[PDB]
Amino acid sequence: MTEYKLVVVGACGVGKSALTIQLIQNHFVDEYDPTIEDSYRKQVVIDGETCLLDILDTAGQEEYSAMRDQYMRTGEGFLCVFAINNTKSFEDIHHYREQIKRVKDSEDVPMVLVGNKSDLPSRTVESRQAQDLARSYGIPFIETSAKTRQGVDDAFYTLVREIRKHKEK
Amino acid sequence: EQMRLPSADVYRFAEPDSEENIIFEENMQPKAGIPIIKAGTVIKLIERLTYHMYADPNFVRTFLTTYRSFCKPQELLSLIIERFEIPEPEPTEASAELKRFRKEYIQPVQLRVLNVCRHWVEHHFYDFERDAYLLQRMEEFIGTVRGKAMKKWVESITKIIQRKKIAITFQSSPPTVEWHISRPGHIETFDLLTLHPIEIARQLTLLESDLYRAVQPSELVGSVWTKEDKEINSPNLLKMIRHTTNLTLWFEKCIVETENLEERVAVVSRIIEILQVFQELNNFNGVLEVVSAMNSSPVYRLDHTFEQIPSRQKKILEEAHELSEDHYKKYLAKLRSINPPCVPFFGIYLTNILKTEEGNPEVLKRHGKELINFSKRRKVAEITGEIQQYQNQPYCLRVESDIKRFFENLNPMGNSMEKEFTDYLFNKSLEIEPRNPKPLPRFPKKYSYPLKSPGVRPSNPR
Ligand SMILES: NCc1nn(-c2ccccc2)c2c1CCC2
């Protein structure tokens, strides 16, 4: 069974946690202990191919800025997450991408841009803007709503599809 | 017979337990045989915080550490005062039921409230430093209290209040301080290779231990270090992280600014020796600040440097890196199995607190009624308790005030911004060891003293 090591990156306040938690936690239980091992590993069927997702989310460790390379180095694929109500988190995306390319020593690292919605304030990043940024990088854009679970599967599954397409070559 | 309390009309804590106001986890409290509260209304939580049948130290601690997400300090004080002021049930037909009720309900409950006040003022005094009126109200409530059984606790609370408004030596002998090329007092020559690697590790372990010990639960609960007021609410945690970051960066800088290959090998080798001592001291923050530097993108790519690292030190570095692999699996197992003194890596705790708070609802609903999710808070308090268990035991090492100062005032970035500085480190990496197929240049030596390490074993006995 193939295992995909995925890494979630983004500014603090983005609800990066929520994304990963909503993926892993069962579709109708709101309960989560991050101390156990099932917290970050999920078995899933994507395009008829059963596989194992291992998701690294270091939410809360953003101030350990010199550890980003260490964490990034562990991943084959990356979710770059911003919040649609935080323009600064959107602008920081450029930096995360550059740092990932540098760590993986490659121009063509499997990657997806994710814009997450939760609660107030209202939107400051229109989806068009994010579609344009994603197109300039040549990566997919997925918009998600943590609280309703909309787009969460699509975000992670699209990243796996990106890794498969990269490994063919 | 049960008791016969007042009606809920005249006293809100008499309301019976039901599925709509309090619910429990299936298992029972360790050591104590008390039920574990999963959720309840704030009234029911306060009832159980001050419960008549038994004391609940664990619930009291957990509650006072975590209540502020669901109840403001002013509201808590109002509720415990309300709890204290118990009316007597309707006239005795005049005292069988009244002396019983006074002794087995009123008095126990009143003592439990006083216990809460004591613990609040002793262990969470910051609520009072931040809200002077809250302290005013506590002091005028404590003056209200009249009973002779109460006298001793009232005295004690007043004594704690007074102490709290007011503004290391060893068990046996610490080991002899180690010097290499730099002599004592000559702070101008201090550097990575001139100080003794043992003493670098010891003095960094002392700094990082004090930094770890200063971080309080108030800086962590509610994930406050990630919010816009983080500098206001989590100053000690942030200082601690910035130190760690500074040192990782200083290690990177020492490496890539040593342009001569032989010298750079000596630098990396010396940094691995410091790691070995961190590992001996169980300074896992130290261990990780070295591991982070070595995995950094300017350092990791230096294949020519790594090639010349003696195999023993390669193995040391590889073992340390493996602590971090598979979501800190080996680090976690190692930490569980050692006793103080140590310096944990804080990042794991931060992530676990955040995810606990984010991944669980603030309330649960039952029959249309909103109950505070207390189990969520318990989990956070478990993490802050695990943090606190490594904060009590100091290291048996002498401070060297010059070496200490040297590491406190380290500033590898200087006046530069982060992006600018890390780009400089990376461009320096590219200069000293270009990408294939470009050949390796030579660079002149910068160090006019010997590069040989004194090693990692103490010079003198005991
Ligand atoms: N690619 C060569 C290389 N590998 N590593 C390394 C090995 C194990 C763990 C962490 C880092 C280092 C280099 C240059 C100095 C550090």
UniProtKB/Swiss-Prot annotation, chain A:
Positions where N-acetylthreonine occurs in the chain: 2
Annotated phenotype, changing residue 59 to T: In GASC; also found in bladder cancer; somatic mutation
Subcellular location: Cell membrane; Endomembrane system; Cytoplasm, Cytosol
Record PTM N-acetylmethionine, positions in chain: 1
Outcome following mutation: residue 61 to L: Promotes GTP binding
Disulfide bond entries: none
Notes on how activity is controlled: Alternates between an inactive form bound to GDP and an active form bound to GTP. Activated by a guanine nucleotide-exchange factor (GEF) and inactivated by a GTPase-activating protein (GAP). Interaction with SOS1 promotes exchange of bound GDP to GTP.
GO cellular component terms, semicolon-separated: cytoplasm; cytoplasmic side of plasma membrane; cytosol; endoplasmic reticulum membrane; focal adhesion; Golgi membrane; membrane; mitochondrial outer membrane
First-level EC class: hydrolase
N6-acetyllysine modification, residue list: 104
GO biological process annotation, one example: type I pneumocyte differentiation
Pfam families noted in UniProt: Ras
Outcome reported for the amino acid change (mutating residue 38 to A): Decreased interaction with MAPKAP1/SIN1
EC nos: 3.6.5.2
InterPro entries: P-loop_NTPase, Small_GTP-bd, Small_GTPase, Small_GTPase_Ras-type
Impact upon substituting residue 13 to D: In GASC, JMML and OES; also found in a breast carcinoma cell line; somatic mutation
Motif range (Effector region): 32-40
Disease entry from the Swiss-Prot or TrEMBL record: Leukemia, acute myelogenous: A subtype of acute leukemia, a cancer of the white blood cells. AML is a malignant disease of bone marrow characterized by maturational arrest of hematopoietic precursors at an early stage of development. Clonal expansion of myeloid blasts occurs in bone marrow, blood, and other tissue. Myelogenous leukemias develop from changes in cells that normally produce neutrophils, basophils, eosinophils and monocytes.
Family: Belongs to the small GTPase superfamily. Ras family.
Name of the featured protein: GTPase KRas
Curated annotation (Swiss-Prot), chain B:
Tissue specificity annotation: Expressed in gingival tissues.
Annotated ranges, domain Ras-GEF: 196-435
Domain N-terminal Ras-GEF: 33-165
Functional summary from the UniProt entry: Promotes the exchange of Ras-bound GDP by GTP. Probably by promoting Ras activation, regulates phosphorylation of MAP kinase MAPK3/ERK1 in response to EGF. Catalytic component of a trimeric complex that participates in transduction of signals from Ras to Rac by promoting the Rac-specific guanine nucleotide exchange factor (GEF) activity.
Self-association and partners: Interacts (via C-terminus) with GRB2 (via SH3 domain). Forms a complex with phosphorylated MUC1 and GRB2 (via its SH3 domains). Interacts with phosphorylated LAT2. Interacts with NCK1 and NCK2. Part of a complex consisting of ABI1, EPS8 and SOS1.
Disease with which this protein is associated in UniProt: Fibromatosis, gingival, 1: A form of hereditary gingival fibromatosis, a rare condition characterized by a slow, progressive overgrowth of the gingiva. The excess gingival tissue can cover part of or the entire crown, and can result in diastemas, teeth displacement, or retention of primary or impacted teeth. GINGF1 is usually transmitted as an autosomal dominant trait, although sporadic cases are common. Noonan syndrome 4: A form of Noonan syndrome, a disease characterized by short stature, facial dysmorphic features such as hypertelorism, a downward eyeslant and low-set posteriorly rotated ears, and a high incidence of congenital heart defects and hypertrophic cardiomyopathy. Other features can include a short neck with webbing or redundancy of skin, deafness, motor delay, variable intellectual deficits, multiple skeletal defects, cryptorchidism, and bleeding diathesis.
Protein name: Son of sevenless homolog 1
Effect of residue 153 to L: In NS4; promotes constitutive RAS activation and enhances ERK activation
Bridged cysteine pairs (disulfide): none
